[PDB]
């Protein structure tokens, strides 16, 4: 080991990926840029989470102006808003975590390697870097690449769920809409959002639409699934968590307790992890926390027949996602 | 000139009340409730946290058992049974039954016995004549005295479901409806017997439900009985909910073909009971809306010309409460 | 004879101030200023809104790139990022409303004269721009005054009150708490907040507690009472709508009987339209559209004693404000 | 040896006091009372919580019907309405936790002892039965006394609180207000709520008033207090964690230096573990988990001068007061 990496972005996903990766064994960061938040202020953002409970593992403390130290374990802070400038390799961060949602172009995230990092890991979709879900086609990474996107929290819940049936009974067509918390880009109070004017409404008062490529995506990491899904999402007051809500023709018919006992089966061989399977009343706060990608949720979906059917499956898009953030820094670590 | 009475003063119940209070041809002169006294009434009648203030008109009272809407009397029972409440004495023809608790048609019907002629059951009946108005209301013969008005879910989803049908043929459908909290939710983790999730801290979580408005459907419009069901996620909103409709159609269609044949049946027949907007609009444009499904044109996608997924927003307390007093109207016509 | 004003900011404030000018007999709003929202997505946002519902007192629509037709009426549309840019006599605007919250320096709001406007009213604390408060010194206003501003919603709140309490029995000392409704200053999600740390927390997940120098503010407005009174605030999730809770020690001995008829009585009086009185079991929402500055809750109030009360007024932090910027512009129009 | 209890209304705090009791080295909980949740039930509504996370401490079975086996330790189920028909003793509770919230009075909850319980210990304040605080007045429990109670959790927050301020500097007057999370008794829509007429009003979408003796009950654990402190409530959006916010006069002279000096030494001292101190940006959910009945929020507070203050003061109205029955039950016990 230790595989060295530092962190582009210190917000939801950014510091959740640094307590997965402070926490692991084989993991260890090295730095973290945002010209946002200062040393001082970047122990204060990363003990307390509203969401996820106050930080509890080490002691958090500043060295100086620019180095945290976790224990004591030392990380560099940077405060620099040019990717290009971003020194990453004076404090030996070999791969960097892209987590800005400002630099998801291959070009723009690319801008990490002038100051010497290695890969680069964008924590979103990317419109010309490859992206990889794990469990469905990571495998396909090759180490001549150097910037990838994890593809998008939405997609790593849909895209295992997907896989499994396809891989049992055979996908036809496919609608998926997913309920999701709100996010970042969203408004307290109606605001502007010139991009996504449903967007800019009050986020905690709505249920607020919006378009999604996520479901699409799905036909990019399983290609024989290519313009056989699409949907759209539901923003809805809640702080974290969301689900995925598929609605599948397949192919060969299969009763509700047949696809029930695949994704039973699937949870506990080969995609042990990232898909969980879970038969109770469970709500949305029972899944905080959650490491896996899509939890399969057997008692909400329903058949209405046995080749139509809806599919439900749960997934905490800032946990579950940072986790397979850091697995796929550990599959790209292990290549070759 | 028709007289109604309303059993159980609640979300319902009062949005009902207003509904007729404001109409010029209908008459609310009776109101009863067991665990709303007179004085009391007319604090929850007057504020509301999501329809406003009431300013039509003054609000008092006369005595304990008379409240006055600016110059109408409205009598006010306390009564436990439906059995027991003289309607008649009130002379009102046509009770809302919006408890909850008296679906059943043998239960609604105790209403008869104080006299009342009719009885409209504001929520789905096991047992009672299934009408959602712009879908099967014609279907009413004046021999039927107590009927259903199905539920807040089936009115939006019933109406879209049937221009669909009808111009594309839907072979099979699953809906899902996102929908605002209720009355039977809880504040906090609490006992919930017959539904676990919604016992459930409800603006805190995303909790799924089991939903018959999808099946229901087939009561009201034959040639869809068992091609539709679904289910639905209770969400931290106080009112307003939307559907969302998955469906696979005979004949090729492409989304814009769709659209045009939802606007138009928004601007004939079924004008007043669908809407069809194609602007960026959330939850709250839609607080107040009467209209029974809002057709959201750009919320919605297809993945192809045979298969696609609709969106239909819906106040669920205004929009009902309006169809529950268009129901009586056509009633009333009915000879 | 209308008096012809401008915005600039089209916000929360700006948007209200708006409705309130188009729908009143003596103002009339001749254009708008606000890099952020193009001429058509104005249209959008100023026609829905989460929490004072549609507008439907006019038609609404575009004339042109640059014009907008409010019933008929013409309203100029700029899109200018700094403010001594802006031809507001071009579109003949007397009065600006300064509502971007950028701009409550002084020096920074006279900017607007450059383009030929003539008065500028802040909506919001200044520094160094004298602040008026309808009700309470407002009539201190003098006509060579260009530049002034109308306070805080929270001051416009806390004043009227204070000012009767203190006229009738004299307010010794006098400590406010403000349970406030979130505002676009915070965040959806744990967010970068360097000037307000606690302000960057979750917004409609957390109580959040807030310094204020609102009821400082009221020694500006009302020299007796400089030095005799201040508080803090606490961020709670709720939309709009805000609540004063006063606890103050008073020279002369009153029952609450005494202390509630003399709000009553300045309500029915010299106060009215100011101050409103209330003897209702009322909640938040029931004051959403209440155009008062400061609605007394007389139920919601205790006293420990005749000289030491617990005093609460609500206030649509949003509409009530509004309404005041255009009763202050109105003042100003009536000096000399 | 282990002091056996059993627990009366299965709720927020009858569950919450049940963990504690669970992860306790000396208190055995043996015996539940819920008639309305049935042994299966139990333990869905047991094992996970929307506020506390999934009880991951030891397992749940079922063994049969009227038994429930956490972590290979048997707890007893009753369905029973009526108090007077518990046998308590046939299960060993010495020690009945009265939380239903409506058998409050002394002899209502005195019912428990016909079934064989030895002390009543109700978890809200009682019109009659003896209160106590546990670090305030919980030495003047005499073994005379068969039912008690433990006061609120908001009398928890402020009475230690009072009594190191009082001890200090002397409290001549004071007036109290808590922002209150949302709690069982309140409605998720506008609903029926006949004794409390605001309380019935849309919980998540209104700051609602309420009354509260909570204040004027300081008096009844802290004598010299008594007739010196009342004040009133806020109920606001939130699923858990409350605060009080007290404006008070006192009679020797201190910076606020130095009473944020008096807190934290009675935070390091006496009063460790009741009372707490913090000097960071906290929020709400950053209380979440806290055990102690009053924590300190030095940086939130506010004086006007040296001798009239604000202190604000942070608790988890469940977890707090859940722990403190246990500490009730302990310091009982440890005085038989
Ligand atoms: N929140 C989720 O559920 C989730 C799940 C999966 C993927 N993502 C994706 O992860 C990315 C970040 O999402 P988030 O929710 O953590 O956002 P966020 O807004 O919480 O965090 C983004 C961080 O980037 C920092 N930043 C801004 N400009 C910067 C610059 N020039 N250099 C360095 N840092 C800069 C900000 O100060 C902020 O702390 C997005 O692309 C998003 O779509 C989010
Ligand atoms: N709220 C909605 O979105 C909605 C929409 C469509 C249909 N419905 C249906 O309407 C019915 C009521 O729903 P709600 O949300 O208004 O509920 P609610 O709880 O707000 O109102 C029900 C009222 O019934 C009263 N009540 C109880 N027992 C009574 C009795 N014996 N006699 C007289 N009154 C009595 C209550 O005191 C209460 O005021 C239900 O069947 C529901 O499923 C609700
Ligand atoms: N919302 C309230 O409760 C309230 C009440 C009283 C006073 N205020 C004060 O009013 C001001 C605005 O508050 P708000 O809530 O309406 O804020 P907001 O964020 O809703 O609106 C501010 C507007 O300013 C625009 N803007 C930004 N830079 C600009 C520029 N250079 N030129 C022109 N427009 C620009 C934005 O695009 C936005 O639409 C603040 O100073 C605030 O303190 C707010
Ligand atoms: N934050 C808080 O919620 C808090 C803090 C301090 C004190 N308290 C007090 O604790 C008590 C309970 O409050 P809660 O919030 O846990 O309430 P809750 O409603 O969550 O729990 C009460 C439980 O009592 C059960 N119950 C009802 N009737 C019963 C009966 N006859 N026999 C046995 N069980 C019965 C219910 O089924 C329910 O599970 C109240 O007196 C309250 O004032 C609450």
Known sequence: GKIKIGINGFGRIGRLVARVAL??????????????????????????????????????????????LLGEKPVTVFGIRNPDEI??????????????????????????????????VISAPSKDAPMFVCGVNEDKYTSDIDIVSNASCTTNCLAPLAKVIHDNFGIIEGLMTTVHAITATQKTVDGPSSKDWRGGRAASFNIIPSS???????????????????????????????????????EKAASYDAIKSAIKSASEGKLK??????????????????????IFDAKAGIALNDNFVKLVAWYDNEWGYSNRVIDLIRHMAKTQ
Chains 1, 3, 4 share one sequence.
């Open 273 to 294: 992890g990232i898909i969980g399977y879970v038969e109770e009343d469970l709500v949305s706060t029972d899944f905080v926390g959650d490491s896996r990608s899509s």
């Open 212 to 250: 999604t490529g996520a479901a699409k995506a799905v036909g990019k990491v399983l290609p024989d699934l290519n313009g056989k899904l699409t949907g759209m999402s539901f923003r809805v007051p809640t702080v974290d968590v969301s689900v995925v809500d598929l609605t599948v023709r397949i």
């Open 23 to 68: 926490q692991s064994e084989d993991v260890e960061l090295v730095a973290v840029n945002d010209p946002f938040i200062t040393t001082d202020y970047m122990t204060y953002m990363f003990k307390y989470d509203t969401v996820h409970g106050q930080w509890k593992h080490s002691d958090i403390k500043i060295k100086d102006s620019k180095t945290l």
């Open 87 to 120: 020194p990453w390799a004076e404090a030996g961060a070999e791969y960097v975590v892209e987590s800005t949602g400002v630099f998801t172009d291959k070009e723009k995230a690319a801008a990490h390697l002038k100051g010497g990092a290695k890969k680069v």
